[PDB]
Amino acid sequence: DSHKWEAREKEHYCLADLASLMDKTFERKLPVSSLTISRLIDNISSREEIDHAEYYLYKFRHSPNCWYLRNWTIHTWIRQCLKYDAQDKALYTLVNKVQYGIFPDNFTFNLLMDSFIKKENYKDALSVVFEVMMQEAFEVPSTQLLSLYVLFHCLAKKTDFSWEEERNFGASLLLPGLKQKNSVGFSSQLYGYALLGKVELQQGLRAVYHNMPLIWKPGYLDRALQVMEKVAASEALDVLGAVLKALTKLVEQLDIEETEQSKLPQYLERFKALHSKLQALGLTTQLVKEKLSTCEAEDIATYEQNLQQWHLDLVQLIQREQQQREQA
RNA sequence: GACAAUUAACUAAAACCCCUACGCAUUUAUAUAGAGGAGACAAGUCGUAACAUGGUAAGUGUACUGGAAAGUGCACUUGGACGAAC
Ligand SMILES: [Mg+2]
Ligand SMILES: [Mg+2]
Ligand SMILES: [Mg+2]
Ligand SMILES: [Mg+2]
Numbered sequence: 001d002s003h004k005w006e007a008r009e010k011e012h013y014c015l016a017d018l019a020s021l022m023d024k025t026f027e028r029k030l031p032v033s034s035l036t037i038s039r040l041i042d043n044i045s046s047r048e049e050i051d052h053a054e055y056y057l058y059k060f061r062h063s064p065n066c067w068y069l070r071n072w073t074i075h076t077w078i079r080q081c082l083k084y085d086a087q088d089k090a091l092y093t094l095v096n097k098v099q100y101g102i103f104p105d106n107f108t109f110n111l112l113m114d115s116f117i118k119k120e121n122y123k124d125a126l127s128v129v130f131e132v133m134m135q136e137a138f139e140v141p142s143t144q145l146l147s148l149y150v151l152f153h154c155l156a157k158k159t160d161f162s163w164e165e166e167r168n169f170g171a172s173l174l175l176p177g178l179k180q181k182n183s184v185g186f187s188s189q190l191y192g193y194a195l196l197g198k199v200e201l202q203q204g205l206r207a208v209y210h211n212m213p214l215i216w217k218p219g220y221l222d223r224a225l226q227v228m229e230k231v232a233a234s235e236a237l238d239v240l241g242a243v244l245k246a247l248t249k250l251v252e253q254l255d256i257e258e259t260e261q262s263k264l265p266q267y268l269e270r271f272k273a274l275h276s277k278l279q280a281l282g283l284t285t286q287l288v289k290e291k292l293s294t295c296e297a298e299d300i301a302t303y304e305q306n307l308q309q310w311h312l313d314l315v316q317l318i319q320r321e322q323q324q325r326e327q328a
Numbered sequence: 329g330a331c332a333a334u335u336a337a338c339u340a341a342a343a344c345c346c347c348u349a350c351g352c353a354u355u356u357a358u359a360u361a362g363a364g365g366a367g368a369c370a371a372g373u374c375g376u377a378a379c380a381u382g383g384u385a386a387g388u389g390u391a392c393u394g395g396a397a398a399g400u401g402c403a404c405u406u407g408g409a410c411g412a413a414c
Contacts, residue, residue, distance in 0.1 A: 030343060031336045064342040313338075320337080 001111065001300070005079065005307050008042060009314070015043040019052055022059075031064035035318055038073050044080045050089050053077060057093075061101050069101065070317075072310040075108040082115055091124060094131050105137040107303045114145070122153055130168050133212060138178060141296055147176045147188060148292060151285045164210075170196040171212050181295070184287070186227050187235065197221040198241045201261055204249055218253065218260055225270050232274060232281065242268060 018040055025032050037060055041053050057077065060069055081090040090112055093100040109132060116125045129149055150172050160166060170192055177189030197220050199207055209216050224238075246264050253259060260267075 025335075028335095028343075030334075031341065033336065064340090065336075066341095067339070068337080070338090317338090324335085 002079075004300075004304065005075075005310075009311075011039060011042065013043065015040060015049065015052070018043075019056060022056055026059065026063075032060070033321070034065070034068040034070055034073065035321065038070070038076070041073060041076045041080065044077075044083075047084055050081060050084070054089060054093070058099055061099060070310075070313065071104075071106065071108070071306075072313065074102045074104050075106075075111070077102075078104070078108060078112050082112060086112070086115055086119075087124070091128055094128055094134075097131070097134070103135050105132075105135055105140070106306070107140065107142075107300075110140075110142055110145075113142075122156075125149070126153065129172060130165075133168065133172050133175070136175075136213060138175065140302075141299065143176050143178055144288065144291055144295055147173065147179070148288045150176075151288065155285065164207075166195055167199055167207060168212070170194075171214060174214070179291075181291075183231050183234075184291075186230050189227060190224050190235075191237070193220050193224040193227075194238045194241065197224075198244065201245050205252065206250065216252070221260075221267055228274055228278070232277065238271070242271065 018036065022032060022036055022040060037056070040056060044050055044053055077093075078090055093102060097103075113125070113128065113132075116128075129146065132146075150169065154169065161169070173188055174192030174196070177185060177192050179185035179188070196208060196214070200218070200220075205216070205218060208214050208220075245261075246268060
């Protein structure tokens with residue numbers, strides 16, 4: 001899928017007149033273009049020019065041009081990063097991202113990420129799955145390969161996983177729970193409300209909405225009990241964390257609605273009251289390999305109208321600088 | 329008397345920055361080597377200028393002169409007189 005955008009509609013092939021000129025407007029504090037940076041990102045050919053586009057993508061965010069870092073500016077930093085090693089830096093720019101700022105929720109996430117299975121990347125792609133969750137996303141079909149990835153190392157670690165990592169799995173299983181094609185789209189989200197549910201009782205309800213966007217209401221375990229009832233319209237772990245509360249700071253609630261360190265019985269008895277019928281009416285990681293095999297027709301159609309739309313965003317973003325050196 | 333008159337711009341924006349006046353100059357006041365005036369009065373001195381026709385009627389203007397009041401010329405004044413029939 002490399003050979004579809006790289007007809008770049010040829011421009012100049014130097015950087016050292018240009019990664020100089022991107023600083024002499026920054027000694028005088030003057031804003032720069034969206035298109036002096038694009039000519040700098042389109043001249044990476046080594047590991048060092050990754051850095052010279054990295055130290056200079058530091059300074060476009062911290063500039064008068066806070067925006068006007070295009071979508072096609074972003075991906076030509078990615079699409080030119082996966083040439084050499086594709087190991088650390090494009091992972092790093094979403095690790096920091098606050099002085100780097102890409103937020104690529106398009107098929108441009110997919111082009112970096114689907115390369116990472118070829119090097120299998122368990123401890124490297126451990127974090128980008130956590131840190132593509134730092135944006136709200138998922139009208140594109142990349143919801144499946146995400147939850148295909150998270151169940152690969154979920155069974156690998158059987159711990160509390162961190163002070164913070166367990167609630168990230170819940171957000172990396174709840175907000176990916178838009179796969180309504182099967183009972184899996186409600187039984188994955190069954191687990192998604194589940195492992196948010198324990199920690200607030202252990203730690204406090206403020207831990208849910210600390211950095212990533214989930215709602216703040218004490219109803220999370222209840223929402224499973226309303227989507228355990230959506231599989232009844234048409235799995236072992238949730239017993240054991242629940243009984244753990246049945247076994248041996250800023251407050252935001254009022255008083256006839258009691259706290260959920262006093263809501264032990266109805267959280268237990270209702271979990272059996274349909275489990276008795278869940279066995280009456282009608283494994284996790286193997287089937288999504290078939291959901292890899294059966295779904296995802298690989299809609300490159302939205303990519304290829306975008307590259308022409310990037311070409312529709314291309315010329316009129318330079319021919320503005322065509323008049324500006326013939327009207328003087 | 330100066331300078332600035334630029335980039336950047338699917339949201340719009342960031343950047344803008346000079347200076348030369350003051351000197352025992354300019355204006356009034358205080359202080360003074362020295363010179364001069366006016367006023368006052370515990371007692372001097374030289375005259376006798378004025379007040380009576382003040383012993384040359386007094387005075388004004390002005391000039392000249394003299395220890396000092398003053399003197400005199402020239403022209404005015406009565407704020408002097410001429411004694412009021414012959
Ligand atoms: Mg006499
Ligand atoms: Mg006489
Ligand atoms: Mg004589
Ligand atoms: Mg004579």
